[PDB]
RNA sequence: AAAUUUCGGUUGGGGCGACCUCGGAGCAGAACCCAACCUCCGAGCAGUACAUGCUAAGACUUCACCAGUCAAAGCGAACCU
RNA sequence: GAUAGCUGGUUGUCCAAGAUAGAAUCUUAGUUCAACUUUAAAUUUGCCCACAGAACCAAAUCCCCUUGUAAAUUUAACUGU
C-alpha cells in the first residue's frame, strides 16, 4: 500500500518523532493566568468560594426530595431473588452454526461456558441459566438441551426437532464449581455433591410438564403428546433414530459433573484420579 | 360530632370501609358494594377509632 | 455406570425402564399451513369442510350453518388469527379455535330485533 | 454522601434512596406518591386512585439518585417472575 | 443521546472507493448524500444514521 | 343490508370473490414519547410496546 | 448537688407591639403574571346516599420539586353543593 | 492543619460567548430548585406576523398564514448569576 511507499523515505522513526493522536491528550487547565485567576473559577463569597457546601441532596433545611417519599418493598428481598441469564433459541442456533457448542454432546452448562455463548457469573445470586422463546421458527438443532427454566412453547419447539429438554438445579457452590471447573480442580478438593432444591422449587422440578429430573419418567410422553396436540407437529419417535443412547443420558441427581461422580479427586499434574475408599466416606457420599 | 367508624362486611370477609355518623343516633347498617362477591351486602359498624 | 442415592431407578421403582420414557384427532396432513407476515406473524389455515372425513356429519352441518363467513368460494373453512410475534402461538390459537368450534357444534342485537319487528309490521299488505 | 470510604476507599450508596425508589435499566426512577396511607377517608376517590399509582422522576432527580448510588445497582434484574421485567428495556424511540 | 451512526471498523485498501460506493448505494434511500467521515489511519468509516442491516446485506451481496 | 341471497347471487350469476369490509377506526393519537415523563404513571411505557410479550435483545 | 444543651424568623438599626397556613376584592381595569408592618372580608368546616365502586386515552398545574385539579371510554347499577 | 453562612488573598500571552420572573429554607451576609449563560450533537420551525377569535358585575395583551429573516426544540454535561 501507499503506507510503505511513503515510509520508504523520511528518516528513521526514533523516540523523538512520537506524537499522540491530535484531540485525545487534552491540555491541562491550571489556575495560573489572567483568564484562569483572580477567583480561580470558584465564584463570589460564600461556601462556593470556600468549598464547604452542605451534603448531597440537602435543600437548605427542608425535607429533602429523597425523604418525603414513603418507603416500599421494592428491593426488599432483592439479595435472594433467583436470577438467570436469558438464553435465546436464535443464540443456540448461531452457536451451533459457528462450531462452538457442538450438538453431538449434551448441552451441559460446562459446554456453554466453554463455547462462551452466555457468560454467567457464580456470584450475583445466579443459580443457572434460563431459556427464551425468541428463535421459535427457523430452528433445527436436534440435541438434548439442559436448562434450568423452560416454557411449553420452546419445549415443544425443541422436542418436535428431535431434541430432549430437561431441567436441573445447581446449588451455589455446585454452580460456582460448574462455572470454572479448572480452578476448582486446581484448588485440591473432592468433587462435592449438589444438594436438593428448596420447598419453592420442589414442586416445580417434580413435574413432567416442565421436564424435571425428579418426576415420573412415564409422564414424559403424556406431556409430549399434549404439547404436540396443542402446537401441532407430529412427535418424531426418538427411539427410532441414530443417536438414542447419547440422548438417553439424564444425569442422575447429586452428580455435579456429567462425566465424573462426587467423592472422586482429580489431579491436574499426572493425569490420574483417586478412588474415595473407606466405607464411611462412600456411605456419606453415595450411600 | 361525626365519629368515623369502620363498616364490617358480612359476606365476603376481608373488605371494609369507613363512614361518618353523628354521635347521637343508632348504629348504622347500610348496604355497600363488595369487590369479592360483586354484590350489595348489609354491613355492620364495629370499633370506633376517631372522635371529631 | 454411576448410580447416585436419589437416582431415578430408586425414586420410582415402578417405571424403571430405560427406553419406556420415550414411548406413546385433527390430522395435520389434511389441513393446509401457510404464513404471511402483515409486526406480528399470521398463521393461515384452510381445509375443505365437505370432505372433512375427520368430522361427523351433524358437526359438519352445524359448522357450515353457523360459521358461514369463514367458508371459501370453493367450500373451504378459512380462518386466521394474528395476535403475537411467533407463528407457533398463532397455530396453537387456531387449533384451539377449531377445537372450540367442533365442541360447540357437537353440543347490539336489540336494534336489529327492533328493525326486524318494524319490517315485519310494515310487511302487512294483502289484497 | 461519602465520596470516599474509610475502610476500602470507595463510594457509598444511601440506603434511603434504595428503599424509597426503584432502579431501572432504561434510565428512569420509579417512586410512589406520598400520602397513600394516611387520611384516606377525607380524600375523594379520584385522589385515592391517583395516589395509588406509581410515578417517574425528573432528569435532575434521576441524576441525583444515580449519583447517590453505585454501579452495582445498575445491574440487570433477570428475576424468575417480576412484574417489572418488561420495563428495563425501552423500545421505539427517536430523540 | 441523539447522534447515532454505524462504524465499519475493518477496512483495508482504498477507503475512498468504498466511501464513494456506499454513498452511491445510500443516495436513493434518503435523496441527500450521507455525511461520511473516512479515516485513512484507522481503516474505519462513519455514516450518520442507522444502516446496519442494509450495509450488511450489501456487503454479503458483494461477497466479502 | 347483508343477507345470504347476496352471497348466493355473487357465487351463482357473478363468478367472482365477493369483497368484505369492517369499517376500521383511525389509530390512537399517542403524542411524542417523552424521555422523562416525570408525572406519568408506569403505564406510559405500555403505550409504546410491540407487544407485551417478553422481548430480549441478544444473550 | 452533680453530667450535656438551647434561648426560632420579619421588623425602613435591635428589643417592645403585632404576625408565621390557606381563599377572595383594588393595586394586578381586556391570556397568566407579581410585593405586604398597603385598606378589607373568611376557614382548620358544614347537610343526604355509600356504584363517593374497580379500571384507564389525554391535559391543567400557584411561577421549581414534593404536593394538587378535569377527563372519552372499559366492567358493574338507571329505566353530590 | 478543629470548626466557622465570616475579613483577606488565590501568580504567563491572546480570541470568542457571556446580567438573573419566582419559590422553599429555625431563612432573607448562607443553600436547593426554577430561570439566565457555556460546550458537542439530532431535529424544524423561533420573533414582528392579518381577517378573525379572547366577560355580566386608556396606553393595552394572547394566537396569527404570505413577509423580513436564521433562529428555535431536545439530548449529555457542569461551573457562574
Ligand atoms: Mg494553574
Ligand atoms: Mg426546618
Ligand atoms: Mg432580625
Ligand atoms: Mg409547574
Ligand atoms: Mg361513559
Ligand atoms: Mg481552616
Ligand atoms: Mg447562619
Ligand atoms: Mg475586607
Ligand atoms: Mg502565588
Ligand atoms: Mg465579547
Ligand atoms: Mg422548621
Q: Which residues of C touch F20 (CB under 8 A)?
A: 69
d(CA A12, CA A9): 9
CA angle D68/D71/D77 to nearest 5° reads: 110
Q: Which residues of A touch D68 (CB under 8 A)?
A: 56-57, 66
Q: Who contacts A70 (Cβ-Cβ below 8 Å, separation ≥6)?
A: D20, D32, D34, D36, D37
Which residue range(s) make up the domain with A170? Answer: 80-287
* Cis, peptide link before residue F51, omega less than 30° from 0: yes
Interface test with D, best of A57, A66, A121 (most D CBs within 10 A): A66
d(CA E40, CA E12): 10
The Cα of F37 is separated from the nearest Cα of chain A by a number of Å equal to 18
d(CA A254, CA A195): 6
C residues 51-110 near A, CB within 8 Å?
86-89, 91-92, 95-96
Q: Which of the 8 DSSP states describes residue A132?
A: B
Distances (CA, A) of A200 to A81, A168, A194, A206, D41: 12, 14, 17, 11, 39
d(CA C89, CA F52): 14
What residues are paired with B6 via a beta bridge?
B18, B46
Of A178, A34, A21, A185, the residue nearest A114 (C-alpha): A178
Provide the grid cell at B5.
367508624
User: How many angstroms separate the CA of B13 from the C1' of G47?
Assistant: 32
Contacting subunits of C (3+ beta carbon pairs below 8 A): A, F
Count other Cβ atoms within 10 Å, centred on residue B45: 18
Count other Cβ atoms within 10 Å, centred on residue D56: 21
Q: Which helix (H) or strand (E) holds E44?
A: strand E44-48
The answer to whether F10 and F16 are in contact (CB under 8 A) is yes
The β-bridge relationship of strands A164-166 and A144-146 is parallel
Look-up of cell digits 384452510: C46
d(CA C68, CA C49): 11
Classified as helix, coil or strand, A129 is strand
Using CB atoms, which residue from F11, F17, F53 is nearest to C85?
F53
Ligand 5 center–CA B24 separation, angstroms: 40
d(CA A42, CA A55): 18
Domain membership of residue A170 (yes or no) is yes
Q: Which residues of A touch F54 (CB under 8 A)?
A: 132
Look-up of cell digits 358437526: C59
Q: Who contacts D51 (Cβ-Cβ below 8 Å, separation ≥6)?
A: D33, D35, D36, D43
Domain membership of residue A216 (yes or no) is yes
Strand G contacted by A65 CB (< 7 A): yes
Look-up of cell digits 357473478: F14
C with B: 3 or more CB pairs under 8 Å?
Answer: no
Using the CA of E48, which nucleotide's C1' is the nearest one?
Answer: H42
CA angle D48/D51/D55 to nearest 5° reads: 155
Contacting subunits of D (3+ beta carbon pairs below 8 A): A, F
Domain membership of residue A98 (yes or no) is yes
Provide the grid cell at C28.
395435520
Look-up of cell digits 470556600: A50
Q: Following DSSP, what letter does each residue of D31-84 receive, concatenated? A: EE-TTTTSS-SSS-HHHHHHHTSEEE--HHHHHHHHHTS-GGGGS---BSS-TT
Provide the grid cell at D50.
391517583
Q: Who contacts D57 (Cβ-Cβ below 8 Å, separation ≥6)?
A: D21, D28, D29, D30, D31, D65, F36, F38
Q: Does F15 touch chain C (CB under 8 A)?
A: no
- What is chain B's alpha carbon radius of gyration, rounded to the nearest angstrom? 11
Output E10-16 pairs: Cβ under 8 A, ≥24 positions apart.
E10/E43, E11/E43, E11/E44, E11/E45, E12/E43, E13/A1, E15/E39, E15/E40, E15/E43, E15/E45
Domain membership of residue A106 (yes or no) is yes
Using the CA of A65, which nucleotide's C1' is the nearest one?
Answer: G66
Q: Could you report how far apart the first and last alpha carbons of chain F are, in Å?
A: 55
Give the number of residues written for chain B: 52
The β-bridge relationship of strands A265-267 and A126-129 is unpaired
Q: Which residues of C touch A286 (CB under 8 A)?
A: 3-5
Domain membership of residue A206 (yes or no) is yes
Q: Which nucleotides of H are covered by protein (CB under 7 A)?
A: 3-16, 24-27, 30-34, 41-43, 74-81
Give the number of residues written for chain E: 64
The Cα of C96 is separated from the nearest Cα of chain F by a number of Å equal to 20
Strand G contacted by D35 CB (< 7 A): yes
Strand H contacted by A34 CB (< 7 A): yes
Strands, DSSP E only, in chain A?
83-85, 126-129, 144-146, 164-166, 265-267, 272-274
Q: Following DSSP, what letter does each residue of A235-260 receive, concatenated? A: PP-TTSSS-STTTT----TT-SSSSS
Q: Which residues of A touch C24 (CB under 8 A)?
A: 221, 225, 235
Closest residue on chain F to C116 (Cα): F1
Q: Could you report how far apart the first and last alpha carbons of chain D are, in Å?
A: 33
Count other Cβ atoms within 10 Å, centred on residue D57: 22
Ligand 2 center–CA A51 separation, angstroms: 23
User: How many angstroms separate the CA of E30 from the C1' of H64?
Assistant: 34
Domain membership of residue A72 (yes or no) is no
Domain total of chain A: 1
Strands, DSSP E only, in chain B?
2-9, 17-22, 31-33, 40-48
Q: Could you report how far apart the first and last alpha carbons of chain A are, in Å?
A: 72
d(CA A211, CA C21): 12
Q: Which residues of D touch A83 (CB under 8 A)?
A: 76-80
- φ, ψ at C44 (rounded to 5°): -95, 140
- What is chain E's alpha carbon radius of gyration, rounded to the nearest angstrom? 11
The CA-based dihedral angle spanning residues C80, C81, C85, C91, taken in that order and rounded to the nearest 10 degrees: -70
Domain membership of residue A101 (yes or no) is yes
Ligand 8 center–CA A44 separation, angstroms: 14
The answer to whether D78 and A83 are in contact (CB under 8 A) is yes
Residue D64 CA neighbour count, 13 Å, CB half: 16
Count other Cβ atoms within 10 Å, centred on residue A136: 22
Q: Which of the 8 DSSP states describes residue C48?
A: B
User: Between C87-106 and A152-159, two packed helices, what is the crossing angle to 10 degrees?
Assistant: 100
Contact F54 A132 (CB under 8 A): yes
Q: Following DSSP, what letter does each residue of C50-94 receive, concatenated? A: TT-TTS-HHHHHHHHHSS-TTB-TTSBB-EEE--SSSHHHHHHHH
Strands, DSSP E only, in F1-59?
none
d(CA D18, CA D69): 8
Strand H contacted by F35 CB (< 7 A): yes
Domain membership of residue A195 (yes or no) is yes
Amino acid at each position: 500500500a501507499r503506507a510503505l511507499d511513503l515510509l520508504r523515505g523520511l528518516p528513521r522513526v526514533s523516540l523523538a518523532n512520537l506524537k499522540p493522536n491530535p484531540g485525545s491528550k487534552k491540555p491541562e487547565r491550571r489556575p495560573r493566568g489572567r483568564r484562569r485567576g483572580r477567583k480561580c473559577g470558584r465564584g463570589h463569597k460564600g461556601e462556593r468560594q470556600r468549598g464547604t457546601r452542605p451534603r448531597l441532596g440537602f435543600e437548605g433545611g427542608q425535607t429533602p426530595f429523597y425523604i418525603r417519599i414513603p418507603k416500599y418493598g421494592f428491593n426488599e428481598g432483592h439479595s435472594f431473588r433467583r436470577q438467570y441469564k436469558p438464553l435465546s433459541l436464535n443464540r443456540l442456533q448461531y452457536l451451533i452454526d459457528l462450531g462452538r457448542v457442538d450438538p453431538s454432546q449434551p448441552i451441559d452448562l460446562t459446554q456453554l461456558v466453554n463455547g462462551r455463548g452466555v457468560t454467567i457469573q457464580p456470584l450475583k445470586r445466579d443459580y443457572g441459566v434460563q431459556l427464551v422463546e425468541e428463535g421459535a421458527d427457523t430452528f433445527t438443532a436436534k440435541v438434548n438441551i439442559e436448562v434450568q427454566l423452560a416454557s411449553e412453547l420452546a419445549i415443544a419447539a425443541i422436542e418436535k426437532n428431535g431434541g430432549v429438554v430437561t431441567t436441573a438445579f445447581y446449588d451455589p457452590r455446585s454452580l460456582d464449581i460448574v462455572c470454572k471447573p479448572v480452578p476448582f480442580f486446581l484448588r485440591g478438593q473432592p468433587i462435592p455433591k449438589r444438594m436438593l432444591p428448596p420447598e419453592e422449587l420442589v414442586p416445580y422440578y417434580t413435574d413432567a410438564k416442565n421436564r424435571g429430573y425428579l418426576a415420573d419418567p412415564a409422564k414424559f410422553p403424556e406431556a409430549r403428546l399434549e404439547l404436540a396436540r396443542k402446537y401441532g407437529y407430529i412427535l418424531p419417535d426418538i427411539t427410532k433414530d441414530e443417536l438414542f443412547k447419547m440422548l438417553c443420558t439424564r444425569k442422575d441427581p447429586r452428580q455435579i459433573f456429567f462425566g465424573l461422580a462426587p467423592g472422586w479427586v482429580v489431579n491436574m499434574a499426572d493425569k490420574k484420579i483417586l478412588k474415595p475408599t473407606d466405607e464411611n466416606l462412600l456411605k456419606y457420599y453415595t450411600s | 360530632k361525626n365519629i368515623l367508624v369502620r363498616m364490617v362486611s358480612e359476606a365476603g370477609t376481608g373488605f371494609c370501609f369507613n363512614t361518618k355518623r353523628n354521635r347521637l343516633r343508632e348504629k348504622l347498617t347500610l348496604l355497600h358494594y363488595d369487590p369479592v362477591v360483586k354484590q350489595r351486602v348489609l354491613f355492620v359498624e364495629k370499633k370506633k377509632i376517631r372522635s371529631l | 455406570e454411576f448410580k447416585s442415592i436419589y437416582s431415578l431407578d430408586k425414586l420410582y421403582p415402578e417405571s424403571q425402564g430405560s427406553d419406556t420414557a420415550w414411548r406413546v384427532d385433527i390430522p395435520l396432513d389434511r389441513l393446509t399451513i401457510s404464513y404471511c407476515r402483515s409486526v406480528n406473524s399470521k398463521a393461515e389455515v384452510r381445509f375443505h369442510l365437505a370432505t372433512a372425513e375427520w368430522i361427523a356429519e351433524p358437526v359438519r352441518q352445524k359448522i357450515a350453518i353457523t360459521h358461514k363467513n369463514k367458508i371459501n368460494r370453493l367450500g373451504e373453512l378459512i380462518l386466521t388469527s394474528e395476535s403475537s410475534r411467533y407463528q407457533f402461538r398463532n397455530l396453537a390459537d387456531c387449533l384451539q379455535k377449531i377445537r372450540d368450534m367442533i365442541t360447540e357444534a357437537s353440543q347490539k342485537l336489540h336494534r336489529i330485533r327492533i328493525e326486524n319487528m318494524n319490517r315485519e309490521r310494515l310487511r302487512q299488505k294483502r289484497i | 454522601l461519602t465520596y470516599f470510604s474509610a475502610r476500602k476507599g470507595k463510594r457509598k450508596t444511601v440506603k434511603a434512596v434504595i428503599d424509597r425508589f426503584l432502579r431501572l435499566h432504561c434510565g428512569l426512577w420509579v417512586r410512589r406518591k406520598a400520602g397513600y396511607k394516611k387520611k384516606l377517608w377525607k380524600k375523594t376517590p379520584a385522589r385515592k386512585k391517583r395516589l395509588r399509582e406509581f410515578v417517574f422522576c425528573n432528569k435532575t432527580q434521576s441524576k441525583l439518585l444515580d449519583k447517590m448510588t453505585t454501579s452495582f445497582w445498575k445491574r440487570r434484574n433477570w428475576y424468575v417472575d417480576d412484574p417489572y421485567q418488561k420495563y428495563h428495556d425501552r423500545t421505539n424511540l427517536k430523540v | 443521546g441523539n447522534r447515532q451512526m454505524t462504524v465499519i471498523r475493518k477496512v483495508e485498501g482504498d477507503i475512498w472507493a468504498l466511501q464513494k460506493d456506499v454513498e452511491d448505494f445510500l443516495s436513493p434511500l434518503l435523496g441527500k448524500t450521507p455525511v461520511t467521515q473516512v479515516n485513512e489511519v484507522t481503516g474505519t468509516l462513519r455514516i450518520k444514521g442507522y444502516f446496519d442491516q442494509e450495509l450488511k446485506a450489501w456487503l454479503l451481496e458483494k461477497g466479502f | 343490508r347483508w343477507d345470504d341471497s347476496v352471497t348466493y347471487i355473487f357465487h351463482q350469476l357473478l363468478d367472482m370473490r365477493e369483497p368484505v369490509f369492517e369499517f376500521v377506526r383511525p389509530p390512537p393519537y399517542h403524542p411524542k414519547q417523552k424521555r422523562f415523563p416525570h408525572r406519568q404513571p408506569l403505564r406510559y411505557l405500555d403505550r409504546y410496546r410491540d407487544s407485551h410479550e417478553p422481548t430480549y435483545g441478544i444473550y
